[PDB]
Paper text:
Whereas nanoviruses have T = 1 icosahedral capsids of ~18 nm in diameter (although no detailed structures are available), geminiviruses are formed from two such isometric particles, or ‘hemicapsids’, fused to form a geminate particle (18 × 30 nm) which gives the virus family its name. Here we present the cryo-EM structure of AYVV at 3.3 Å resolution. The structure shows that the capsid is built from three distinct conformations of a single CP, and that these conformational differences facilitate the formation of the interface between hemicapsids. The body of the CP is similar to that of STNV and many other viruses, consisting of a jelly-roll fold with two twisted, 4-stranded β-sheets.
Structure refinement with D5 symmetry, yielded a density map at 3.3 Å resolution, and an atomic model for the CP layer was built and refined, starting from a homology model of the STNV CP. The capsid is composed of 110 copies of the CP, and we built and refined a complete D5 asymmetric unit of 11 unique chains (chains A-K). Each hemicapsid is formed from a T = 1 particle from which a penton of CP subunits is missing. The different conformations needed to build a geminivirus arise through differences in the N-terminal domain of the CP, rather than in its core fold. The biggest change is in subunit H, where an extra 23 residues are resolved as a helix-loop-helix motif (first ordered residue: 40). By contrast in chain I, an extra 8 residues (first ordered residue: 55) become ordered, but in an extended conformation that is different to that seen for the same residues in chain H. The helix-loop-helix motif from chain H is a major component of the equatorial interface, making a series of H-bonding interactions to a patch of predominantly polar residues in the body of the CP subunit across the interface (residues 214 & 215 in chain I), which is surrounded by van der Waals interactions. The ordered segment from chain I extends across to stabilize the base of the helix-loop-helix motif in an adjacent H subunit, presumably stabilizing the ring of equatorial subunits. The map was of sufficient quality to build 7 nucleotides into the density beneath each subunit, except for subunit H at the interface where there are 6. More significantly, a new interaction occurs between the backbone of nucleotide 5 and R41, at the extreme N-terminus of the helix-loop-helix motif in chain H. This motif forms the equatorial interface, and presumably the interaction with DNA stabilizes this structural element.
Residue numbers in the entry:
A (entry chain B), B (entry chain F), C (entry chain A), D (entry chain B), E (entry chain A), F (entry chain A): 63 to 257
Write the structure that this text describes.
DNA sequence: CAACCAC
DNA sequence: CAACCAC
DNA sequence: CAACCAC
DNA sequence: CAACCAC
DNA sequence: CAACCAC
DNA sequence: CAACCAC
DNA sequence: CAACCAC
DNA sequence: CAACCAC
DNA sequence: CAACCAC
């Protein structure tokens, strides 16, 4: 039961260790960016299956910001988009929402067929002068059998793939002040035998 | 399994993206206000079936209000009236309650046959000078097999209704200060074949 | 047996009566174009199923061209793109081939996933000073259950298409002279019930 | 068992409330006149099935006429005509009869294949100086599963349909003086899925 | 096995030996014409069943025409109209087509219900100065159980026809020159027992 | 059903888009040539299975050649040699034949064991001053499970081949003039698991 | 069978 | 269980 | 699962 | 489900 | 069906 | 399948 | 099979 | 039952 | 059903 259908070989990892600075406008990153090559943690051919994503790390408030009394959450929309073209679209223009508000957000009407939300998961942080909740921990494993397809070329970029691009979209709920998110996004995949 | 009884065609959506300023008196809006027309997100006949309501968004406090130390829950009441007539009745004259208190709110004895509460749900928010819970995220998917009927005229209003009509009543529990609720109310409906 | 799966209603028709002047470079047209409306020969919803395409007409030479001793054939590639964006792509840039020769034509290696060749069918014409053959008849019915989607907006254009979309690509085999093609491309479809 | 075969959707009504002034020569009206459009009580496509006709109202004598001692009946021939062309033919020239007499009337020999009588129903009124029967009531429901076909255009006119036109033919039995008939003819129909 | 349903008697024949000079505009003839009478090759009743049509003969060029380097084909559309009225309609006004091109010909959208194409069968001829092909043979048997009706009167004319009626429509593909067609159109029928 | 026995992975493609100028002597090319590498369209191991060959393109005359009254045909012998050594052998020395006539061609008696003719398929062209036929289309798909081996080294050459190896041999039937052949020879293979 | 229309 | 690693 | 959209 | 009311 | 790519 | 030779 | 006519 | 509306 | 005509 370990390896999925249409794909074979050892379960290959790929990590995206990064400190993401989050805003109200919303940040994006492509989680299914795999370079091609003979090396370990590379894809072999143009086709592979991402079995599971493991998001883990911490969301936290800056030292000058944490004094100010407020609350903010981040949403973590893991969305698959079929038909990925050019640059990855911004959070604001993919998601329909009232007054640029991430809590009210759903996929736009025109491109609802294109993009689908696989997971969303709120993580909340509260500021305070005398008593803050500076940080909150993220530990979300998620099994999502997602088959992707690349071009003839290889550079682990959003442009280079042409099917089921997996995108992580983040957005801070509070409008004024930002928050940081130190995250390891770890994607687990297998190389496809099909085609 | 997808389409309800006596219904046809694609699952049409209708959205009510809005910032509602809530009070102790209570605010109302009809969630079934949909126009008749050939286009998408329009009804075709006078009858149609609402399958599910997806309320999602945020409830939040203003900057001058959040300093003042208090708590308030917003009560969301989803009611169906079997009989609409004229404009929609205010929260005070539908629900009976001690001293206009929405936590004690149930339907009046006279019009208990008329109005029925399908779902109710709360959302707490706490203000504070040095440490606050400024906001709370409302997310609520509610499935209800509700058949609604309209007049011959087609303008998407509570006046044009007949038989059932889905009303959302929102009320702040605290007396003096108000709160905002930035909400997307999304109704999912199908066009009817019956009569 | 008549209507396909997930679609309903009367078999609606659409036609493209037009004289297409062909070159070696390659002409294109989108056969799945159909505007939205309450009237006949219009899609109701954004989704619809094309069940069958009926190409019929004539491919013919001009009076000054036919006198010259040569032969030319037209290929007629009916292709479906699962990802339409903006303007319909040119023949030369979709099909890779030696020296832009349409008889040596297959889909490019990059976008082999996007474009699929549903049908090809040649039609041949021979021009000579005395021993001539001015014209040739085309009569090709071809059945394909093909579910195309549109944007929210209503206009018969390849821009507005989404998910599946049909494209007829025509290209003359001989380099240094053209041929005309008077063709009724007819298309038979049904309105979708799904989503 | 409600909706007939080959047709679907809500049962749509169409009414013809009118005061028909009847003569010996005979009056006609097309009962299956349905305009096409998105609106309520419109047809959707060119094809629909009339399930049932409900004729109701009153036949009555004028104030100066009712003094004169006589009797007259009206026949109410509900006839389907296949092959409707141009204007609707007059009662006198469709029906063969002795000396322009409606009581002796049957369909003409040439166009017996074209026209068929679905219903006839006599309604009788008697005049008198000192004691009249001024009026008589009509209440005739009639179930007649009749599939009709329209042109590409739409205006709810006899010319605009090309199959199974339903015509009501009235004719006063007494030669000299006329009678009035205030009638609601109400036709019940469903939109066709076939073709 | 021989005689069709609802008809009886000896298989009566009828023939139309005639040189039909063809154009680009389109020539027509009614093959179901047969006068009423006690003699042979006459219908007895107003109804009769045409069981089969046997078209045979030659399609040929003139001596001055054949010298010119060109090609032309004739279409031979055998159609049944279920509603005959007056004179037989012209080819151009029944079949819609781009620039009156008979190879791009199908029945008009308005009267698609009235006219049905039972058979089409092309016949091709190539004219040249030396490398010529003056003529081409036509030999097409085609079986169709077809119940036609007449008026009360007795004359082999399309005027007098009613219910089904057969029409052969002929049209030359090339525009600027004619072709001759010496054709025996033969038709085999039986007298109806029904009605 | 898709992948052959003893081989695995995605169906890798290889192409040979080239204008082959043909003579009476006989041109050759090795269609099984494929270099070793981690990239796409490369064999991984020394062994691999060619499942199918798709020849498509055009065979055509030059402008000065076509005017002369003659005919020529090309044979297209697809042969497998089970013993490749060095450079690919010439057409004349493999096939024995009277006066180097390629239509009278079969494998020599000495090396009948080595070479086997898998497919032959003619393509004919006729040149004339006025009554010409400049070109002819080739479209030949042909499926053969064919396990080829290589040397230790990595280069797409017949030298490096071992065990089975494919060779396309082309030869013009007419002696005193050439013909061009613009051909995409495409080949579909899978990497071997055995040994 | 022809090409959404009919026996 | 934790997260391609192992009992 | 998240929310009429796809796998 | 929310609470004697309806679907 | 066309030609490793898809319903 | 091509044409006594092979998978 | 040819084309209402026959073995 | 009355007439596309509902028990 | 209304009356040789059609569904």
């Amino acid at each position: 039961p370990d390896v999925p259908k249409g794909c074979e070989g050892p379960c290959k990892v790929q990590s995206y260790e990064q400190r993401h600075d989050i805003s109200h406008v919303g940040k994006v990153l492509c989680v299914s960016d795999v370079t091609r090559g003979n090396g370990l943690t590379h894809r072999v051919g143009k086709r592979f299956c991402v079995k599971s994503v493991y998001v883990l790390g911490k969301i936290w408030m800056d030292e000058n910001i944490k004094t100010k009394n407020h609350t903010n959450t981040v949403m973590f929309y893991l969305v698959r988009d079929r038909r990925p073209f050019g640059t990855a679209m911004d959070f604001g223009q993919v998601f329909n929402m009232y007054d640029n508000e991430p809590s009210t957000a759903t996929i736009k009407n025109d491109l609802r067929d294109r993009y689908q939300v696989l997971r969303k998961f709120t993580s909340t942080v509260t500021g305070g002068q005398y008593a803050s909740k500076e940080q909150a921990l993220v530990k979300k494993f998620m099994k999502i059998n997602n088959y992707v397809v690349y071009n003839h070329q290889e550079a682990a970029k959003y442009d280079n793939h042409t099917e089921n691009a997996l995108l992580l979209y983040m957005a801070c709920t509070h409008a004024s002040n930002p928050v940081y998110a130190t995250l390891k996004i770890r994607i687990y995949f297998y190389d496809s035998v099909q085609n």
